[PDB]
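Private note to self, pasted from the team thread so I don't lose it. Backbone tokens:
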């Protein structure tokens, strides 16, 4: 069973990145992560229409204007998928609060507590939940507050710049989801190089820098590389605390028999060069702005998740009204 997947598991905790809960346990992941785009995709599958129907019933039950009924249905839907996923894994599932709240700290904290409450009603303790939030300054502060004030653990996503990584570390959030694949995308579409080797992959370099910094300075926030375009990127990050991978690439790793070696370790990180820095809001916003790719990928990532949430909403509205 010496597949690249089984080998990877010796150095990194594997996480499944999908809303399709029937395609998980094959890869035996510890945790699982979902996002608006993944839920939208799964909610469109014939095999999960019962969850959609149940979510619609819930929205109607609480009443109010269509926007309210749709809001409750979508939250119920995210939680239904989360609850089903938890039956396929022994760990945690990440559930993301609507991206349209990415610049509203208080609204994110409120929506996070609402989801948690919905999970509780489903018989799920918050110990098995990771509330996912956009890594904007307000999202990061919402995470800090959720962690400290409510014991609600968060997964900071759409993490592209070093500024975001530092802010998350200082905020003490449970976990960060620094992207790899979308960073490669930006470089392909914005530079004179369309191909990169694993170690040279811009996304790999980003996570590598973040990992080393976190470990060198002892931050306990979990580093989970996310978003992948190929298995090379994943292998180049062997050793990272966690790695959330789509079922497609997990299947590929399961069929790969090449020998894999750890590329990241705490011991080696303690030798890295990055200097420690502290960031208040001002410093964070400036340093983030210095990373063009990050500014653009965080911005576009928020718009895409909002767009997908709206698509899911149009789907629901058409059926419940």
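Design output:
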């Amino acid at each position: 069973s010496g597949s690249a997947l089984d080998q990877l598991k010796q150095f990194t905790t594997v996480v499944a990145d999908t809303g399709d809960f029937n395609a998980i346990d094959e890869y035996k992941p510890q945790d699982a992560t979902t996002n608006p785009s993944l839920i939208l995709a799964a909610a469109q599958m014939p095999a999960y229409q019962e969850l959609v129907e149940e979510a619609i019933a819930y929205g109607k039950k609480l009443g109010g204007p269509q926007e309210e009924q749709i809001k409750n249905a979508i939250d119920k839907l995210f939680v239904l998928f989360g609850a089903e996923i938890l039956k396929k894994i022994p760990g945690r599932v990440s559930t993301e609060v609507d991206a349209r709240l990415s610049f509203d700290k208080d609204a994110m904290v409120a929506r996070a507590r609402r989801l948690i409450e919905l999970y509780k009603e489903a018989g799920v303790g918050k110990d098995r939940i990771l509330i996912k939030l956009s890594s904007t300054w307000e999202g990061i502060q919402a995470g800090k507050e959720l962690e400290e004030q409510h014991g609600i653990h968060c997964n900071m996503t759409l993490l592209f710049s070093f500024a975001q990584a530092v802010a998350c570390a200082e905020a003490g959030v449970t976990l960060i989801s620094p992207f790899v694949g979308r960073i490669l995308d930006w470089h392909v579409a914005n530079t004179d190089k369309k191909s990169y080797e694993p170690q040279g992959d811009p996304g790999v370099k980003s996570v590598t820098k973040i990992y080393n910094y976190y470990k060198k300075f002892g931050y306990k926030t979990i580093v989970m590389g996310a978003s992948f375009r190929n298995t090379g990127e994943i292998k180049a990050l062997a050793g990272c605390d966690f790695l959330t991978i789509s079922p497609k690439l997990l299947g590929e790793l399961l069929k790969d028999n090449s020998k894999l070696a750890p590329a990241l370790s705490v011991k080696a990180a303690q030798t890295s060069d990055s200097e420690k820095i502290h960031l208040d809001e001002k410093a964070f916003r400036w340093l983030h702005n210095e990373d063009q790719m990050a500014v653009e990928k965080l911005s576009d990532g928020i718009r895409k998740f909002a767009a997908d949430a709206i698509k899911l909403e149009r789907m629901l509205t058409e059926r419940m009204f």
